[PDB]
Design a protein around this ligand. Structure first.
Ligand SMILES: CCCCCCCCCCCCCCCCCC(=O)OC[C@H](CO[C@@H]1O[C@H](CO[C@H]2O[C@H](CO)[C@H](O)[C@H](O)[C@H]2O)[C@H](O)[C@H](O)[C@H]1O)OC(=O)CCCCCCCCCCCCCCCCC
Ligand code: CLA
Ligand code: CLA
Ligand code: CLA
Ligand code: CLA
Ligand code: CLA
Ligand code: CLA
Ligand SMILES: C=Cc1c(C)c2cc3nc(c4c5[nH]c(cc6nc(cc1[nH]2)C(C)=C6CC)c(C)c5C(=O)[C@@H]4C(=O)OC)[C@@H](CCC(=O)OC/C=C(\C)CCC[C@H](C)CCC[C@H](C)CCCC(C)C)[C@@H]3C
Ligand SMILES: CC1=C(/C=C/C(C)=C/C=C/C(C)=C/C=C/C=C(C)/C=C/C=C(C)/C=C/C2=C(C)CCCC2(C)C)C(C)(C)CCC1
Ligand SMILES: CC1=C(/C=C/C(C)=C/C=C/C(C)=C/C=C/C=C(C)/C=C/C=C(C)/C=C/C2=C(C)CCCC2(C)C)C(C)(C)CCC1
Ligand code: OEC
Ligand SMILES: [Ca+2]
Ligand SMILES: [Fe+2]
Lengths: 98, 137, 35, 447, 51, 335, 37, 242
């Protein structure tokens, strides 16, 4: 019988500690070596992941892209896809700028 | 007596060397920066893509590394994405594309050095201001 | 809604007319003494 | 002249209301300051103008006019040869010496009345005819001028064409729009959003045809006047006074002054935008273009993307159904420009095209414009009022539209001032109520 | 604390030397100090919530 | 008879009609009655109007939760822009109301009548054989009502912008305008203020001095006002005793003594000044905004030293950011 | 872009636009000398 | 034929594609060939809103409502693969397009019901054994009805979900208990149902047309109040291709 703000609640999970593959917005990837541009679009463009490693299995990844992904897996996480954060293409343009 | 030659020392190469640009270059670097950058990178940000800025730490995580002269220089010659995957000289001003970005035509290897040297000194002076905007104005 | 458009134009035209003519009706003339 | 005999010092030039000879020199001398300027300033521009750096980024406003006529530009307004500029600038600067010589002369040495010095040049205000004559000439003079444009287009080099099929570049018009329908159409087209007024005109065929359709009317009038006198109503309608004649010509200018402020702020055709900055709506459009592209080219599905209010960040519909750009830009869904049209379909911005037909020349052109929008301060500091210094710039489109609204306005004020004075100087009481016979004192009170 | 002047005031929490340690965000998109994220808690002494 | 038209033209022009309906008045009269009547109803009852473009309807009428201070007639929608939205262009009144139809109807009509009202303010003078120009002093307010209701929108691209007909929404127009044009920092407004501030100052002076030199013609127990009689022959106060004091307050020549020269300075100061503000709004309508001194006074190293111009801008940002919270999708406010 | 030869006039060319203002200002020197008859 | 400067303003840009009375054809479904739908359009025509129960459980009906917006209702550009799985039945899978439009209709009494007319993630199928799509064919299916407002939307007093205030900022020392409902913005997500019934066909060009009816929920206002039930009756065009 409590009303809950899904987003504040999700800042209790891994989300709010590491890049959430299923939720966090694309521009989050611009914080680690060669990861943004091409991979980020891939990660995001590939539905939810039952678990971090699953990134490693995205279609046509180069043995190099794969090499990096493994490097940064320690900065990734996964949480239930949260509509409020995913709906409306919010993952490509969450409405923030500088 | 504040813009000392120590505040003018920025990483030259990626191995470790440094260059101590003169107060003459600096100013000119700024003039050249407003001449071909500010239009889109005023204050060290990016009007047509706020995601990527010119903060030194940001350039560091770039690919290849741009937190030094040689790197920035390479860029103004042949720009690429933040991952280095695509060459973007066809939509971002460069020498590889002066035919489309005239302002770039003037620019000479010497100029490119200043403009770059400027992108590295500003944050030394301005600090956080250089990175963000509004919030920091 | 179309009828309202017609009406209004008729109405607006009636007055625009009155105005144009009224001045054409030699207005300079109307005053104490047109030297 | 003197005050205790004429008017008052700060009203000086009215002391010439009846001294045509001098009143000619006044007009000549002045008509020299305009040329002098046109000339002196074009060189000032040129002396600073930098061959390859956007004109709009250099505070130019005269050179842009010359370029639009197809002078020293080439493809995309490339500034191929500066000479036409130097050329145009000086010619004027000289013809100023001529006119200048006339003024100084005619307002000093020459006769201060054309009365007997020549009965054809001498004139009478109330002479409801020598006026219709002088008008007539001038009406012909303007006609020759209009036709000069058609020449520069249909015969000498052509003009600039943003809408140029290949893309912006000089183009010789050879199919002027004849036909009253299309031409005069623009005349009775609402000045409101969408259906603009005269400010529509999105092609040089019409601009040229329209002008051809002017001399062959303007000169047709220049004659009808040198061959007649105001009819009955005409006389019992207007006040035939020198000052009154001014008034009518005052309001005229003022009225156009707005028509101009609107033209340089909205039209893309007769003001390239390659020489001037980008239209205000044009820049608000390009910011969407820029981000509809950036986000698409990054994973987003712009067609389905839904924004904070439920309207869709990149694309939404207009009241009449067309698919337009989203955001505050929903107001500028009227903007039509070269760089954008190829993405338009029959129902508006088409998805398929947007999804994979966006050449790079547009991605960057769209970026150029959103970063050169018509915004800045008095001390020329480009951008929003909260912006920081650097990038000093103010669109020509601003400077122009701004100055002319001031001029345009004050002139309307001017119009009233004189139209009101001459309309009472006639009934004759512009100097006060006649103590002895106060009209009011002989009118039935209202209570 | 709220400076008698402000009708509404943000809730910032800082340590001993006034270092921003926690707070309640406005734009969650990038909270760094949000409670929860920092695991803030509150204890009471004296008064009726004592203990 | 003598053909009623001939006659009609005589009544229309009657110099002795309680209220002077003129040729201009033949328009002013119906136009202002349409506006004024629609405004009064709109303000009392009228659904929320989707002002900005989104679908976040604002209610301004009284029967919908307002009081005189908060209520207003809201500007036609942004989706409408500059487009001409008359009642016949709506699919139904409800559409017309939801989209802000009332505003356009009300301003196009007030601007039309207020203009003829300017024209009328000449016709009568003429018909009374008096000098004109009164109508030119009234061209200042009109010019300001024109700027704010028509010019500013033509520039910005939509009637959604452009001061809304209501007390509080007028404060809105201002607080935002500032943040978008930094108006307080624009010459034309400062002249607007010198005008409006000055005007008042002199209104007190003129009114002051004159009252201070009325010629004793009444007891101590009866109004000073009775000392004057409507239409009375000569002046009612000593224009020389007046100058005798004011001249001595500052210094002789730093004063007036010519009623005509003095009264003109009264009608010229505020009019000239108020014109300007109209020219400011009309100017900032095309984005030539106020002065910008942000990040000037930089020091020796390059540290920005901040001047009052900055604390200003700092407060301007706060405005820029929060205004129209749900109407922006991209970084730059170019509309 | 002022053709080289003429480039010895830059300084002058730079001032020419302002001249017109001067006229209005000279017209005031005139009336001042004539005592504003 | 008609172009942009030909349609602009006529509001024809909202009505979508018709098939001259020549139809009644049959588009041959190969099964050995992959079919997709080039452009699926859905043009709203009538909106009804089941009168909120009276409390007195006496069968509430769907009443007509007035369209307070303009001609901003149509769904177009929708596309995706028209899958031909076993037993002859066809299944359309919505891939992308302008598949949603915020509509606001003023209801009989006084209310204003804003809904998010959509067919997002639609997946409609047809009767088994579909050979050559004919006027007898027709699709049915569910779809997702996102949420009128995005996580980012702020309310007149500042409060919002993914951003914005935490509470009734203007009532500093009041009881939050009763304001909970409006201070915590929940973001719903529900299912909608349609059914496109083919009325015209053009064996040749491979384009069907017809009527549609869908039922969905209104806007709950970040969950401030209960959503109203809506039913939409319109028309639809559909260009099929291999
Ligand atoms: C004190 C006394 C008061 C003094 C104040 C007077 C103010 C006068 C205002 C100026 C009006 C001049 C009319 C005009 O130039 O009229 C034209 C202007 C501009 O028209 C524009 O026309 C179009 C702009 O061109 C566009 O359309 C295309 C043409 O097809 C081109 O491709 C072009 O590139 C593209 O940008 C758009 O439809 C715009 O939204 C707008 O309607 O009208 C407008 O704004 C005016 C709309 C309001 C009507 C005013 C009634 C006046 C009687
Ligand atoms: C289209 C051209 C035009 C022409 C030919 C005339 C002609 C005339 N005017 Mg009109 N006038 C005009 C436009 C024009 N006017 C406009 C637009 C206005 C509204 C402002 C007026 C307002 C006006 C008034 C109020 C008066 C006249 C008067 C007169 C008559 C005498 C001239 C005179 O007094 O000069 C003398 C001129 C000066 C004292 C110097 C010019 C001073 C101005 C204010 C300076 C502007 C300069 C520049 C733009 C600003 C400097 C830069 C600034 C940033 C510091 C003459 C018939 C007078 C008359 O007797 O009426 C019949 C009179 O009293 N005019
Ligand atoms: C620029 C526009 C302009 C022009 C063309 C005129 C023109 C004229 N004015 Mg007006 N005037 C103006 C602005 C202008 N005025 C303004 C702004 C004011 C308000 C201060 C006045 C106030 C005014 C008054 C009070 C009077 C006139 C009078 C006159 C007339 C006689 C001239 C005269 O007495 O010279 C006097 C001669 C001189 C002292 C010489 C001045 C120097 C010459 C003309 C300039 C040479 C120009 C340039 C440097 C050299 C070029 C040479 C090259 C071609 C070789 C003449 C038609 C008079 C009139 O109405 O007569 C009946 C008069 O009494 N004017
Ligand atoms: C704006 C147009 C214009 C107009 C209508 C006039 C009109 C006039 N001029 Mg002026 N003139 C002008 C421009 C103008 N001039 C200019 C720009 C200059 C300087 C180059 C002169 C220099 C000038 C001189 C030096 C003389 C005149 C003279 C005359 C008068 C008779 C001569 C004639 O018409 O020959 C028509 C000739 C052609 C067929 C060509 C006549 C009133 C004469 C005069 O003042 O006599 C009393 C005279 O001696 N004018
Ligand atoms: C016989 C025919 C005749 C002709 C062909 C002209 C021709 C001309 N007049 Mg003149 N004028 C005439 C008779 C004539 N006038 C008479 C009888 C008088 C009474 C004295 C005047 C009084 C007069 C005045 C007071 C003025 C002119 C001006 C002008 C010039 C046009 C302005 C302009 O810049 O246009 C632009 C050019 C084109 C359309 C391209 C061709 C133009 C050269 C004006 C001027 O001096 O401007 C240079 C001006 O101020 N005229
Ligand atoms: C303070 C002085 C002043 C100055 C410096 C300018 C300056 C300018 N005006 Mg403005 N103007 C002013 C006062 C001023 N104006 C006033 C008081 C009004 C009345 C309200 C106007 C009304 C006005 C209008 C209505 C327009 C301008 C325009 C322009 C611009 C181009 C002028 C042009 O093309 O002339 C052309 C000159 C001639 C007619 C000479 C004959 C030329 C022939 C026909 C050319 C032959 C060429 C052939 C093809 C080869 C220029 C920046 C124009 C513009 O582009 O606006 C943005 C425009 O449309 N002005
Ligand atoms: C340079 C410009 C010019 C000027 C100043 C004049 C001036 C004049 N013309 Mg000429 N005319 C011209 C060009 C010009 N004409 C051209 C190019 C032609 C084509 C060959 C003609 C053809 C012409 C004819 C056939 C006649 C005149 C006549 C006249 C005289 C009085 C008629 C009048 O003004 O009625 C003013 C108009 C009205 C009372 C009607 C008002 C109602 C209309 C329908 C509405 C206008 C609204 C407008 C579109 C909206 C904007 C309004 C604004 C306030 C917001 C007058 C001296 C008459 C004359 O006496 O013969 C010599 C005449 O019979 N003219
Ligand atoms: C907008 C600003 C405003 C100003 C600048 C102003 C100024 C003045 N009003 C005076 C008078 C008047 N004003 C009056 C009514 C009004 N005056 C108004 C508004 C103003 N009045 C208003 C709204 C009204 C009501 C209608 C009347 C009725 C009178 C007069 O009788 C009198 C006069 O003679 O009329 C011309 C003059 C008195 C001289 C004096 O006191 O010297 C003595 C004081 C001196 C020299 C010291 C200045 C004192 C102040 C406290 C210090 C300011 C500090 C700096 C010097 C300046 C600040 C800098 C700015 C950038 C902020 C003075 C020129
Ligand atoms: C009447 C009058 C007036 C008026 C006046 C006027 C209006 C004048 C004008 C004048 C003018 C209008 C003048 C002009 C002049 C010019 C000149 C003198 C020129 C020259 C040129 C040259 C020389 C050229 C060449 C060159 C080149 C090619 C290049 C290099 C450089 C140079 C520049 C050298 C006044 C107010 C005072 C007062 C009263 C009376
Ligand atoms: C198509 C085109 C064009 C053309 C144009 C044209 C063809 C125009 C025309 C125009 C015209 C054709 C105009 C007209 C005008 C007019 C006017 C402006 C008028 C006015 C009037 C008045 C103001 C009057 C008055 C009065 C009255 C009403 C009453 C009684 C008294 C009096 C007399 C006072 C162009 C090139 C741009 C471009 C392209 C397109
Ligand atoms: Mn009401 Ca002028 Mn801040 Mn873009 Mn909206
Ligand atoms: Ca120089
Ligand atoms: Fe008085």
């Amino acid at each position: 019988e409590e009303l809950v703000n899904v987003v504040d609640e999700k800042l209790g999970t891994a989300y709010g500690e590491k890049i959430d593959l299923n939720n966090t917005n694309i521009a989050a990837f611009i914080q680690y070596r060669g990861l943004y541009p091409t991979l980020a679009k891939l990660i995001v463009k590939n539905a939810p992941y039952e678990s971090v490693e699953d990134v490693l299995n995205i279609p046509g990844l180069t043995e190099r892209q794969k090499q990096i992904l493994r490097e940064n897996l320690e900065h990734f996480t996964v949480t239930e896809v949260e509509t409020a954060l995913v709906e409306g293409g919010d993952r490509y343009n969450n409405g923030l700028y500088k | 007596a504040e813009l000392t030659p120590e505040v003018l020392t920025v990483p030259l190469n990626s191995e470790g060397k440094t260059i101590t640009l003169t107060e003459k270059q600096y100013l000119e670097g700024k003039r050249l920066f407003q001449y071909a950058c500010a239009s889109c990178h005023v204050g060290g940000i990016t009007k047509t893509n706020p995601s990527l800025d010119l903060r030194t730490e940001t350039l560091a995580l770039a690919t290849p590394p741009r937190d030094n002269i040689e790197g920035l220089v390479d860029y103004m010659k042949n720009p690429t994405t933040y991952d280095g995957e695509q060459e973007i000289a066809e939509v971002h001003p460069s020498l590889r594309s002066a035919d489309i970005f005239p302002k770039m035509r003037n620019l000479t290897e010497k100029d490119l050095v200043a403009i770059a040297g400027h992108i590295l000194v500003e944050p030394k002076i301005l600090g956080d201001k250089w990175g963000g905007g509004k919030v920091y104005y | 809604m179309e009828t309202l458009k017609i009406t209004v134009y008729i109405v607006v035209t009636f007055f625009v007319l009155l105005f144009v003519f009224g001045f054409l009706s030699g207005d300079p003339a109307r005053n104490p003494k047109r030297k | 002249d003197q005050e205790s005999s004429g008017f008052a010092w700060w009203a000086g030039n009215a002391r010439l209301i009846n001294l045509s000879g001098k009143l000619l020199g006044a007009h000549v001398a002045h008509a020299g300051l305009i040329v002098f300027w046109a000339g002196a300033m074009t060189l000032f521009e040129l002396a600073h103008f930098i061959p390859e750096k956007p004109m709009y980024e250099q505070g130019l406003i005269l050179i842009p006019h010359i370029a639009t006529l197809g002078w020293g530009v080439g493809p995309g307004g490339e500034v191929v040869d500066t000479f036409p500029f130097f050329v145009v600038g000086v010619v004027h600067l000289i013809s100023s010496a001529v006119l200048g010589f006339g003024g100084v002369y005619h307002a000093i040495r020459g006769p201060e009345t054309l009365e007997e010095y020549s009965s054809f040049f001498g004139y009478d205000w109330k002479d409801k005819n020598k006026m219709t004559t002088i008008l007539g000439f001038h009406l012909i003079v303007l006609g020759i001028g209009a036709l000069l444009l058609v020449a520069k287009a249909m015969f000498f080099g052509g003009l600039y064409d943003t809408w140029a099929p290949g893309g912006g570049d000089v183009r010789v018009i050879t199919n002027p729009t004849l036909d009253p329908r299309v031409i005069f159409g623009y005349l009775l087209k609402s000045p409101f959003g969408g259906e603009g007024w005269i400010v529509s005109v999105n092609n040089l065929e019409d601009v040229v045809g329209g002008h051809i359709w002017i001399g062959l009317i303007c000169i047709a009038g220049g004659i009808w006047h040198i061959l007649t006198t105001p009819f009955g109503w005409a006389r019992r309608a207007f006040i035939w006074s020198g000052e009154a004649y001014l008034s009518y010509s005052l309001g005229a200018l003022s009225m156009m002054g707005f028509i101009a402020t609107c033209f340089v702020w909205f039209n893309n055709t007769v003001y390239p935008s390659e020489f001037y900055g980008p239209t205000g709506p044009e820049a608000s459009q390009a910011q969407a273009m820029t981000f509809l592209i950036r986000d698409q080219k990054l994973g987003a599905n712009v067609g389905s993307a839904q924004g904070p209010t439920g309207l869709g960040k990149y694309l939404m519909r207009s009241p009449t159904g067309e698919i337009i750009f989203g955001g505050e830009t929903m107001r500028f869904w009227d903007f039509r420009g070269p760089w954008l049209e190829p993405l338009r379909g029959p129902n508006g911005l088409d998805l398929n095209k947007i999804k994979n037909d966006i050449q790079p020349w547009q991605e960057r052109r769209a970026a150029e414009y959103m970063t050169h929008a018509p915004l800045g301060s008095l001390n020329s500091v480009g951008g929003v009022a909260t912006e920081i210094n650097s990038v000093n710039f103010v669109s020509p489109r601003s400077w122009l539209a701004t100055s002319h609204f001031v001029l345009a306005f004050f002139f309307l004020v001017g119009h009233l001032w004189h139209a009101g004075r001459a309309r009472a100087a006639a009934a004759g009481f512009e100097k006060g109520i006649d103590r002895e016979s106060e009209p009011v004192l002989s009118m039935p009170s209202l209570d | 604390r709220m400076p008698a002047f402000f009708e509404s005031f943000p809730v910032i929490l800082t340590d001993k030397n006034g270092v921003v340690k926690a707070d309640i965000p406005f734009r969650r998109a990038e909270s760094k100090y949000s409670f929860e994220q920092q695991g803030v808690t509150v204890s009471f002494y004296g008064g009726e919530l004592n203990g | 008879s003598a053909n009623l038209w001939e006659r009609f033209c005589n009544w229309v022009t009657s110099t002795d009609n309680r209220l002077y309906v003129g040729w201009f008045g033949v328009i002013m009269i119906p136009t202002l009655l349409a506006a004024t009547i629609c405004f009064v109803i709109a303000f009392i009852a009228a659904p929320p109007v989707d002002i900005d473009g989104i679908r976040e309807p604002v209610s301004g009428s009284l029967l919908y939760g307002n009081n005189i201070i908060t209520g207003a007639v809201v500007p036609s929608s942004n989706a409408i822009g500059l487009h001409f939205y008359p009642i016949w262009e709506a699919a139904s009144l409800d559409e017309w109301l939801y989209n802000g139809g009332p505003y356009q109807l009300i301003i196009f009509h007030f601007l039309l009548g207020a203009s003829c009202y300017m024209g009328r303010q000449w016709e009568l003078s003429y018909r009374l054989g008096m000098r004109p120009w009164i109508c030119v002093a009234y061209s200042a307010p009109l010019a300001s009502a024109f700027a704010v209701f028509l010019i500013y929108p033509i520039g910005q691209g939509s009637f959604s912008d452009g001061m809304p007909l209501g007390i509080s929404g007028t404060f809105n127009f201002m607080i935002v305008f500032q943040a978008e044009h930094n108006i307080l920092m624009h010459p034309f407004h400062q002249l607007g203020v010198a005008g409006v501030f000055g005007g008042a100052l002199f209104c007190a002076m003129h009114g002051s001095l004159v009252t201070s030199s009325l010629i004793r013609e009444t007891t101590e127990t009866e109004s000073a006002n009775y000392g004057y009689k409507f239409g009375q022959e000569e002046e009612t106060y000593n224009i020389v005793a007046a100058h005798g004091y004011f001249g001595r307050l500052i210094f002789q020549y730093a004063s007036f003594n010519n009623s005509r020269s003095l009264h003109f300075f009264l009608a010229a100061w505020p009019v000239v000044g108020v014109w300007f503000t109209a020219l400011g709004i009309s100017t900032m309508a095309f984005n030539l905004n106020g002065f910008n001194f942000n990040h000037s006074v930089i020091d020796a190293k390059g540290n920005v030293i901040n001047t009052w111009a900055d604390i200003i801008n700092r407060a301007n940002l706060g405005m820029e950011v929060m205004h129209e919270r749900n109407a922006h999708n991209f970084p730059l406010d170019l509309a | 872009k002022l053709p080289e030869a003429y480039a010895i006039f830059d300084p002058l060319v730079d001032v020419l636009p302002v001249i017109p203002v001067l006229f209005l200002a000279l017209a005031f020197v005139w009336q001042a000398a004539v005592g504003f008859r | 034929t008609l172009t942009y400067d030909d349609i602009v303003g006529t509001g024809l840009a909202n009505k979508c594609p018709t098939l001259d009375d020549t139809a009644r054809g049959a588009y041959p479904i190969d099964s050995s060939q992959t079919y997709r739908i080039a452009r699926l359009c859905l043009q709203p025509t009538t909106f009804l809103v089941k009168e909120e129960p009276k409390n007195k459980r006496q069968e509430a009906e769907f009443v007509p409502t007035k369209l307070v917006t303009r001609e901003t209702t149509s769904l177009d550009q929708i596309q995706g693969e028209l899958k031909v799985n076993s037993d002859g039945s066809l299944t359309f899978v919505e891939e992308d397009g302008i598949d949603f439009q915020p509509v606001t209709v003023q209801m009989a009494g006084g209310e204003r019901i804003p809904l998010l007319f959509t067919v997002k993630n639609l997946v409609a199928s047809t009767q088994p054994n579909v050979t050559s799509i004919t006027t007898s064919t027709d699709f049915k299916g569910e779809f997702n009805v996102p949420s009128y407002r995005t996580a980012n939307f702020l309310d007149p007093k500042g409060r919002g979900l993914a951003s914005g205030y935490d509470s009734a900022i203007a009532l500093p020392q009041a009881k939050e208990e009763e304001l909970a409902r409006a201070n915590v913005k929940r973001f719903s997500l529900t299912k909608g149902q349609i059914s496109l019934n083919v009325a015209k066909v053009d064996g040749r060009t491979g384009e069907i047309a017809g009527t549609f009816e869908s039922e969905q929920l209104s806007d709950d206002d970040m969950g401030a109040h209960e959503p109203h039930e809506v039913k939409i009756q319109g028309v639809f065009y559909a260009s099929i291709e291999p």
